[PDB]
Amino acid sequence: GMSNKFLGTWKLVSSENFDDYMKALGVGLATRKLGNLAKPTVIISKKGDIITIRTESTFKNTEISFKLGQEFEETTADNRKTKSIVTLQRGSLNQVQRWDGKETTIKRKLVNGKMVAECKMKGVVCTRIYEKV
Numbered sequence: 684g685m686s687n688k689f690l691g692t693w694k695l696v697s698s699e700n701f702d703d704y705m706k707a708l709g710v711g712l713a714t715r716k717l718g719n720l721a722k723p724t725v726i727i728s729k730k731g732d733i734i735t736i737r738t739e740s741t742f743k744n745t746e747i748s749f750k751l752g753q754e755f756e757e758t759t760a761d762n763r764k765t766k767s768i769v770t771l772q773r774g775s776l777n778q779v780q781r782w783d784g785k786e787t788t789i790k791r792k793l794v795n796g797k798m799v800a801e802c803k804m805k806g807v808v809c810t811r812i813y814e815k816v
């Protein structure tokens with residue numbers, strides 16, 4: 684299952700191409716300006732086979748709970764209602780969100796003890812690096 688090295692609290696330390704990623708999602712300018720300033724913490728926890736990913740920031744908080752391989756309904760930070768799934772691939776925790784015939788992926792992987800989130804929508808690739816805190 685998911686590595687126990689994911690469990691705990693993570694702080695954003697770098698974000699590359701997030702504005703274009705949000706644009707691809709249809710997020711408007713005022714929201715993007717606050718999203719570009721946000722430096723969230725992400726808390727990953729697990730109870731039995733249920734994994735929770737909680738994001739906290741001044742602007743927006745989110746939380747998802749899921750079992751690997753089991754599709755669920757999600758509310759995203761920008762207020763999309765998606766059909767989502769999280770699965771593993773080579774230890775990467777990979778999320779897909781679907782809605783209105785569109786798709787985005789967020790792949791969260793451990794790299795030298797950091798957590799790297801690769802976020803893809805259309806041709807846009809955004810990379811967000813987190814330190815464990």
Ligand SMILES: CCCCCC/C=C\CCCCCCCCCC(=O)O
Pocket residue numbers: 705708710714717718719721723725738739740742743744745759760761789800802811
């Ligand atoms: C919730 C805190 C960050 C987002 C703040 C701006 C709010 C809405 C715009 C849409 C953002 C959707 C992506 C959120 C980030 C996913 C990748 C990650 O966990 O780093």
